[PDB]
Design an enzyme around this catalytic site. Structure first.
Site, PDB file in Angstrom:
ATOM      1  N   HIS A  10      -6.613  -2.011  -7.123  1.00  0.00           N
ATOM      2  CA  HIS A  10      -7.440  -1.336  -7.606  1.00  0.00           C
ATOM      3  C   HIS A  10      -7.318  -0.863  -9.330  1.00  0.00           C
ATOM      4  O   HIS A  10      -6.625  -1.654  -9.937  1.00  0.00           O
ATOM      5  CB  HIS A  10      -6.918   0.296  -6.999  1.00  0.00           C
ATOM      6  CG  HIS A  10      -5.579   0.561  -7.416  1.00  0.00           C
ATOM      7  ND1 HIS A  10      -5.141   1.073  -8.451  1.00  0.00           N
ATOM      8  CD2 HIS A  10      -4.563   0.354  -6.560  1.00  0.00           C
ATOM      9  CE1 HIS A  10      -4.065   1.045  -8.347  1.00  0.00           C
ATOM     10  NE2 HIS A  10      -3.519   0.756  -7.272  1.00  0.00           N
ATOM     11  N   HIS A 187      -2.610  -3.342  -3.916  1.00  0.00           N
ATOM     12  CA  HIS A 187      -1.957  -2.991  -5.190  1.00  0.00           C
ATOM     13  C   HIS A 187      -1.249  -4.456  -5.579  1.00  0.00           C
ATOM     14  O   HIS A 187      -1.510  -5.420  -5.437  1.00  0.00           O
ATOM     15  CB  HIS A 187      -0.775  -2.206  -4.908  1.00  0.00           C
ATOM     16  CG  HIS A 187      -1.345  -0.743  -4.145  1.00  0.00           C
ATOM     17  ND1 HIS A 187      -1.814   0.224  -4.662  1.00  0.00           N
ATOM     18  CD2 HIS A 187      -1.506  -0.456  -2.976  1.00  0.00           C
ATOM     19  CE1 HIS A 187      -2.089   1.046  -4.057  1.00  0.00           C
ATOM     20  NE2 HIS A 187      -2.162   0.769  -2.916  1.00  0.00           N
TER      21      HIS A 187
END
Lengths: 254, 255
Positions: A10, A187
């Site tokens: 992200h 992530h």
């Protein structure tokens, strides 16, 4: 290649500007991180990606990233599944600490080791840590596939791979083998762990992989789900290289 | 009551103010409709709701409503499942037409039958209709549990119930019987169909039920998965009744 997969980490979260290790603290995307997800979705639309399934962590910033991508694609109906096994690496007692301050106090090399080593485990988070209660009291961790007291209190990157691999093997890989087009919204460290596995990257070479935020990563896989060549960042390579340098420089003094 | 769940229809989009039938056109929420979803989320947070599963249609306005509610609750990790079987009723050739224009052209009584009766079927949508291609070319309807060619070209409310009830019985109701806390983010007529079934409302009486946008319905079901009493709305009852009247008045000639 026989199969193609997209993964990404992200965009900026609410602790990025403060340069603090976030890990399992459930911080939201900031305005810039939301725009990064929209830009990812636009890039994927430009390349005709039609997803059949999306996998995310249980941290809301990976879920919101997926939702923003799907909105840009007009694919909000595509099924999403979320698992703690895609969570960011658990930074233990380092959660909440400022990376630059740590480099000033302990040396840039020490911070680089903590951030990028395959084998080094951070000190575990203790109950006195300011962020312990908000992690372990959360209902999302009372309903996951292992008991609450079995969840990690810190993780090396090796530990991340060990808890991610069962989810890849049991849930994601069979869908890829069916020919489904998958998006993994995860992530930095959980993506690095999966790349290490799929590309066969050595324990030594994985330390030098830093992933830019909010950039789609294309992986081309063969019939055995092994990468046919290195991962490919989809975008302008100059901008992507600057985005990698930005992540590296979080650990540098000044 | 033994079981409770939440159902709601999403808030407004552009065609609410324009007074046009939207149905399977995949229109987005506007700003006000997004705020309606957030307001629903705030009400559910006040009640300490902890959802285990969310069901939506494949129309993005129902999905975005769910996402906004989950964000208000801090429950974005809760599983969402989306199905065409919760889609708004298919309005056929009436898709995109203005409801008040239809009342002027065909009379208020006919429009009320089209909108609210159980058995009356709208005229079917044809390939020449301006919204046909964008509905039937969409990949979401190529991967349904029914072939693209078998999907409806218009639906009575009875038709809606016939395609919604199997999804309720086979996918949602078992989760209710497992004690899970469920949110259904659906549409006006798909919600009315489910209420008709759960409350045992007669074919004649369902015509008098209109649901306001963006208002939670906290349904209470017994051990046999049937409603204990008439549905109730969370919020200010005078505002809710005024909102219901507004929806009814969309099909009326202005005096």
């Amino acid at each position: 290649s026989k199969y193609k997969l997209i993964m990404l980490r992200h965009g900026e979260g609410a602790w990025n500007k403060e340069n603090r290790f976030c890990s399992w603290v459930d911080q939201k995307l900031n305005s810039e991180g939301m725009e990064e997800a929209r830009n990812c979705g636009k890039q994927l639309k430009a390349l005709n990606f039609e997803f059949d399934l999306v996998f995310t962590s249980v941290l809301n910033r990976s879920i919101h990233t997926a939702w923003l991508i799907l909105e840009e694609l007009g694919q909000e109906w595509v099924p999403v599944e979320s698992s703690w096994r895609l969570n960011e690496r658990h930074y233990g007692a380092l959660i909440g600490l400022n990376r630059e301050q740590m480099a000033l106090n302990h040396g840039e090399e020490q911070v680089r080791l903590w951030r990028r080593s395959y084998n080094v485990t951070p000190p575990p988070i203790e109950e006195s840590h300011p962020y312990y209660q908000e992690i372990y009291n959360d209902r999302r961790y009372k309903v996951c596939d292992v008991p609450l007291d079995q969840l990690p209190r810190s993780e090396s990157l090796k530990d991340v791979l060990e808890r991610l691999l069962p989810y890849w093997n049991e849930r994601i890989a069979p869908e890829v083998l069916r020919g489904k087009t998958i998006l993994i919204s995860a992530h930095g460290n959980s993506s690095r762990a999966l790349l290490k596995h799929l590309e066969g990257i050595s324990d030594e070479d994985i330390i030098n992989i830093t992933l830019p935020t909010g950039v789609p990563i294309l992986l081309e896989l063969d019939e055995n789900l092994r990468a046919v060549g290195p991962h490919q960042f989809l975008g302008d390579q100059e901008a992507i290289q600057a985005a990698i340098k930005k992540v590296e420089d979080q650990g540098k003094v000044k």
